[PDB]
Amino acid sequence: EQLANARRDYEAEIARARQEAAKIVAQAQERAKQQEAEIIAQARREAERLKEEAR
Amino acid sequence: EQLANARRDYEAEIARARQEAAKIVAQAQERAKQQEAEIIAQARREAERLKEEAR
Amino acid sequence: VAGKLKGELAQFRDLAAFAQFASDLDATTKAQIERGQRLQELLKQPQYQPLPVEDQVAVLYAATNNYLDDVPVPLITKWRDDFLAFLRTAHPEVRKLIYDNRLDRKFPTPEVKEALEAAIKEFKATS
C-alpha cells in the first residue's frame, strides 16, 4: 500500500507542481512583457522630459 | 524511494521553472536596456539639434 | 514605518555587545542581530541616488515587517535597487497611491497595505 500510494501521490503531486510551474511560467512571461512595456514608457517619458528641457 | 522521487521530480520542475523565468527576464531586461540606450542617444541628438538651432 | 525601524536598530545596538559570541545566542537574539544587520545594510546608500519618499516608505515597510529575513546580508543593497526598479516599472500606481496617501493619520490602510504586499510578493517570486 505504501509503495502504490507513494508512487501514485508522487505522480499526482508532480502534476500539481507542473500546474504551479505553468502558472509561474505564465507569470514570468507576463511580467517580462509588462516590464518591457514599462521600460518603453519610462524611456519615452524621459525622452519627452529631455526634449522639454531642451526647448 | 518513490516518496523521495516525488520530491526529486518536484525540485527538478521548480528549478526548470525558475531557470526559464530568470533567462526570460534577463533577455527582456537586456532588450529594454538596449532600447533605453537608443532612446537616450536619440534624446542627446535632439538636444544637440536644439543647441544648433539656438546657435 | 520608521518608529519600529528605530526600535529594531536600538535593539541591534544594545545586542552589539553579544555579537562577538558564537552559538551562545538564542533564536531571539540571533534573529534580532540578523534584522539589525539587514537594516544597517539597507541604510547604506550610494552617492547621488536620492529616493523619493514613497520609495523610502515602501522599502522600509518591506524591510521591517519580516519580508526581508530570507535575503542574505551582502545582497540587500542590490535587492533594494531591484525592488525600486520593479516598483517604478511594474506598479507606478502603487507608488502614486503611497504618495497621495502618506499624509493620512493611519498610513497602513487596507488598500495600500494589500497592494504593497502583493507587489512585494510578486517581486520576490520573480526574483
Side-chain angles (χ1 to χ4, degrees), chain A residues 4 6 12 15 17 21-22 26 28 32 37 41 43 47 54, chain B residues 4 6 12 15 17 21-22 26 28 32 37 41 43 47 54, chain C:
Chain C
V1 304
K4 50 189 170 68
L5 187 146
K6 179 66 178 65
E8 293 186 307
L9 215 57
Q11 286 101 27
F12 175 41
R13 289 196 309 288
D14 301 326
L15 298 181
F18 302 89
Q20 58 186 352
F21 308 118
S23 77
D24 309 303
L25 277 67
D26 59 351
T28 48
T29 315
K30 289 294 223 308
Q32 188 64 261
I33 286 281
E34 291 148 18
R35 176 52 63 70
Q37 284 184 11
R38 290 163 149 67
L39 273 169
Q40 184 177 6
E41 188 71 6
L42 189 75
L43 297 172
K44 186 184 315 189
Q45 174 165 350
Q47 207 183 10
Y48 305 152
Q49 286 297 77
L51 309 185
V53 61
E54 47 258 15
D55 287 335
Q56 301 210 35
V57 301
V59 162
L60 298 194
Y61 187 9
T64 296
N65 281 109
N66 201 354
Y67 290 9
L68 191 62
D69 287 341
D70 55 354
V71 182
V73 297
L75 302 164
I76 291 174
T77 306
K78 103 182 191 68
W79 189 94
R80 196 195 59 235
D81 274 18
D82 294 352
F83 181 28
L84 293 185
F86 171 81
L87 290 178
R88 294 174 305 108
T89 58
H91 295 89
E93 90 297 6
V94 167
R95 284 166 77 259
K96 183 60 65 177
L97 175 59
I98 287 173
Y99 184 33
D100 54 25
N101 202 6
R102 77 202 184 287
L103 274 293
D104 62 347
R105 280 284 306 97
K106 277 74 69 177
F107 167 69
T109 61
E111 61 202 20
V112 66
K113 167 175 293 301
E114 66 196 343
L116 194 154
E117 286 174 351
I120 288 172
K121 295 324 200 321
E122 170 164 32
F123 173 78
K124 291 178 68 53
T126 305
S127 70

